[PDB]
């Protein structure tokens, strides 16, 4: 029944709204000026960064920004975990599998959602109260510059797909419910849940994007792209935590990364 | 391990 599939899409959309404060729609309203609110403070260099500390925040610059990125990631992992628990069937899974699904899925989700807050010139930060330029971020002394730029590369391509928050809610749920994550104990219930989510996604894209018949197939590909970009991200992280003497990695990130074979 | 993720999940 399609009605069941549409009600599921709607349920996920409503949960998505409750879990993620700054949506792509709200992100775009800010980036376009549609909102009469105070525009976001623009951080384009070391100087502007210093000036906007009190507007984005409620050691050298490179490490300073890397640290900030970790804090956002920690916060996103909590929001993503909350959204995951709202996915029908998720909390009824074995606890150990819930953790595994999160361990391997959160960062692919972070990459996906970061796209909603970016354009070719920069990324919205601090719930849209700040905007840091891509040029400033990629100029950061290596290996930090190369740490940032990859997210933007993905976003520019992903954004060309023109998904909205409604499409994203299901896309994200499908990713979280991947039954091929290393170490899963009860794969069948996960795959059953994902197969239904996939049908919901396919219907969603067919109704919401009638003019783009290839969107479903392209998103399935993005899912595989995200794993590759994640592996590279993890590797890129390994080098930083062992070459940068003063690199405290947040406890949550350590947990996630530890033994991510 | 994953004590934090466990906490968040049963939260
Ligand atoms: C340029 O990014 C940021 C710069 C930045 O200055 C900050 C960011 C981000 C931010 O939103 N981070 C998102 C983000 C996260 C990761 C993941 C890296 C860590 C990991 O998950 O392994 C990679 C990215 C690449 C490009 C753009 C944004 C990326 O979010 C922040 C959180 C804080 O609590 C801060 C504080 C209190 O100092 C910051 O200082 C903020 C305001």
Structural domains of chain A sorted by starting position, each given as residue range(s) with its CATH number in brackets:
1-261 (1.10.565.10)
Query: Is the separation of the CB atoms in A239 and A185 below 8 Å?
Result: no
Quick check: CB of A68 below 6 Å from ligand 1? yes
Q: Do B5 and A95 touch (CB under 8 A)?
A: no
Task: State the helix-helix crossing angle for A187-208 and A215-243, rounded to 10 degrees.
Answer: 120
Running DSSP on this structure, what letter comes out for residue B4? H
3-state DSSP helix/strand/coil % of chain B, to nearest 5: 75, 0, 25
CB environment A25-39: b (16+ within 10 A), e (fewer): ebbbebbeeeeeeee
Question: For testing the chain B interface, which of A98, A100, A182, A183 should be mutated: the one with the most B CBs within 10 Å?
Answer: A98
φ, ψ for residue A43, nearest 5 deg:
-105, 110
Q: What is the dihedral of CA A109, A114, A115, A119, to 10 degrees?
A: 180
Other C-beta atoms lying within 10 Å of the C-beta of residue A254: 13
Question: For testing the chain B interface, which of A70, A74, A75, A81 should be mutated: the one with the most B CBs within 10 Å?
Answer: A81
CA distances from A95 to A8, A173, A235, B7 (A): 23, 17, 28, 11
Query: Is the separation of the CB atoms in A184 and A98 below 8 Å?
Result: no
Point out the ligand 1 atom lying closest to the alpha carbon of residue A237.
Answer: 22
A254 touches chain B (CB under 8 A): no
Q: Which of residues 72-131 of A touch B (CB under 8 A)?
A: 77-78, 81-82, 85, 91, 95, 98-99, 102-103
**Which residues sit opposite A42 in a β-bridge?**
A131
Burial class (CB in 10 A: 0-12, 13-18, 19+), A108: buried
Annotated ligand binding at A70? The verdict is: yes
Q: Do B2 and A81 touch (CB under 8 A)?
A: no
Quick check: CB of A148 below 6 Å from ligand 1? yes
Resolved by = X-ray
Query: Is the separation of the CB atoms in A123 and A149 below 8 Å?
Result: no
Annotated ligand binding at A233? The verdict is: yes
Resolution of the deposited coordinates, in angstroms? 2.1
Using CA atoms, how far apart are residues B11 and B9, in angstroms rounded to an integer?
Answer: 5
């Amino acid at each position: 029944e399609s009605a069941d599939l549409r009600a599921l899409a709607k349920h996920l959309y409503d949960s998505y709204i409750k879990s993620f404060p700054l949506t792509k729609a709200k992100a775009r309203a800010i980036l376009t000026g549609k909102t009469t609110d105070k525009s976001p403070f623009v951080i384009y260099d070391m100087n502007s960064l210093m000036m906007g500390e009190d507007k984005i925040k409620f050691k050298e610059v490179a490490i300073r920004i890397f640290q900030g990125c970790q804090f956002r990631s920690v916060e996103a992992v909590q929001e993503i975990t909350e959204y995951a628990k709202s996915i029908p069937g998720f909390v009824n899974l074995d606890l150990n599998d819930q953790v595994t699904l999160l361990k391997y899925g959160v960062h692919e989700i972070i990459y996906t959602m970061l796209a909603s807050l970016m354009n070719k010139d920069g990324v919205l930060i601090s719930e849209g109260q700040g905007f840091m330029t891509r040029e400033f971020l990629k100029s950061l002394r290596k290996p930090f510059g190369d740490f940032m730029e990859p997210k933007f590369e993905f976003a520019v391509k992903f954004n060309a797909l023109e998904l909205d928050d409604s499409d994203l809610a299901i896309f994200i749920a499908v990713i979280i419910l991947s039954g091929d994550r290393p170490g899963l104990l009860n794969v069948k219930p996960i795959e059953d849940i994902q197969d239904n989510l996939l049908q919901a996604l396919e219907l969603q894209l067919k109704l919401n994007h009638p003019e783009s018949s290839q969107l479903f197939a392209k998103l399935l590909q993005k899912m595989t792209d995200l794993r590759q970009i994640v592996t590279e991200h993890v590797q890129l992280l390994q080098v930083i935590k062992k070459t940068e003497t003063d690199m405290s990695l947040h406890p949550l990130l350590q947990e996630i990364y530890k033994d991510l074979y | 391990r994953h004590k934090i993720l466990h906490r968040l999940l049963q939260e």
